[PDB]
Design an enzyme around this catalytic site. Structure first.
Site, mmCIF file in Angstrom:
data_model
loop_
_atom_site.group_PDB
_atom_site.id
_atom_site.type_symbol
_atom_site.label_atom_id
_atom_site.label_comp_id
_atom_site.label_asym_id
_atom_site.label_seq_id
_atom_site.Cartn_x
_atom_site.Cartn_y
_atom_site.Cartn_z
ATOM 1 N N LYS A 11 0.902 -1.187 -0.036
ATOM 2 C CA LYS A 11 -0.051 0.135 0.002
ATOM 3 C C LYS A 11 0.864 1.214 0.037
ATOM 4 O O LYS A 11 1.594 1.368 0.737
ATOM 5 C CB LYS A 11 -0.800 0.125 1.379
ATOM 6 N N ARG A 33 18.037 5.078 -4.595
ATOM 7 C CA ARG A 33 19.128 4.183 -4.982
ATOM 8 C C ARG A 33 20.074 4.524 -6.218
ATOM 9 O O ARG A 33 21.218 4.153 -6.476
ATOM 10 C CB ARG A 33 18.478 2.844 -5.478
ATOM 11 N N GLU A 61 8.296 14.449 3.758
ATOM 12 C CA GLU A 61 9.676 13.793 3.879
ATOM 13 C C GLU A 61 10.595 13.609 2.952
ATOM 14 O O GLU A 61 11.636 13.899 2.778
ATOM 15 C CB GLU A 61 9.363 12.302 4.425
ATOM 16 N N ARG A 81 5.845 -4.756 -9.548
ATOM 17 C CA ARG A 81 6.397 -4.521 -8.454
ATOM 18 C C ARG A 81 5.457 -4.965 -7.207
ATOM 19 O O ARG A 81 6.078 -4.754 -5.971
ATOM 20 C CB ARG A 81 7.104 -3.181 -8.165
ATOM 21 N N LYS A 125 9.956 4.505 -14.577
ATOM 22 C CA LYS A 125 8.441 4.481 -13.861
ATOM 23 C C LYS A 125 7.350 4.829 -14.769
ATOM 24 O O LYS A 125 6.918 5.879 -14.750
ATOM 25 C CB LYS A 125 8.760 5.754 -12.851
#
Ligand code: O81
Ligand code: CL
Ligand code: CL
Ligand code: F
Ligand code: MG
Ligand code: MG
Ligand code: MG
Length: 134
Positions: A11, A33, A61, A81, A125
């Site tokens: 989630k 990464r 964040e 994923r 992406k």
């Protein structure tokens, strides 16, 4: 602590962080990464965390921005994923200089015209590029 839907998909929540209500320029952040790559800021929902709350927390964040939460755009699966992301509009009203991920991992942020955001997201992406499809 990571959370999952009943089908085992992780989630997540994310925001399309726009510079203004005209929704012409969006804030992307660097991959942790792979810092030369761009992503839509977002991350895991915590236990019992509302998706809108998780989206706003993750954007704070990772991107160091706050603003006026707008509509849910949609719920997007990444089949490869196995995660499922709630994607909201956020109209940025506060840009902070020394935010959690800048201090902790040197995460970068940058404004993109929507067409350019789609272009830089496509290769790694493609589901995030599809958030802008409307
Ligand atoms: O390793 P990738 O390329 O498959 O993607 C990475 C992605 O890295 P990035 O997109 O930055 O290259 C991370 O994102 P992040 O490190 O930038 O936050 C992202 O974490 P997340 O955004 O779901 O989680 P959190 O933001 O921390 O809650 C996931 O990491 P995690 O689940 O091990 O915390 C993701 O891995 P998968 O869920 O397997 O896809
Ligand atoms: Cl804008
Ligand atoms: Cl994705
Ligand atoms: F996180
Ligand atoms: Mg995060
Ligand atoms: Mg994340
Ligand atoms: Mg997180």
């Amino acid at each position: 602590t990571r959370t999952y839907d009943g089908d085992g998909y992780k989630k997540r929540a994310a925001c399309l962080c726009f510079r203004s209500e005209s929704e012409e320029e969006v804030l992307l952040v660097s991959s942790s990464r792979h810092p030369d790559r761009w992503i839509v800021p977002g991350g895991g929902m915590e236990p019992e965390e509302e998706p809108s709350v998780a989206a706003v927390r993750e954007v704070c964040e990772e991107a160091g921005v706050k603003g006026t939460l707008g509509r849910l755009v949609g719920i997007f699966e990444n089949q490869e994923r196995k995660h499922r992301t709630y994607v909201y509009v956020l109209i940025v009203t506060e840009v902070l200089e020394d935010w959690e991920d800048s201090v902790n991992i040197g995460r970068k942020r940058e404004w993109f015209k929507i067409e350019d955001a789609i272009k830089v997201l496509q290769y790694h992406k493609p589901v995030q590029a599809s958030y802008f499809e409307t």
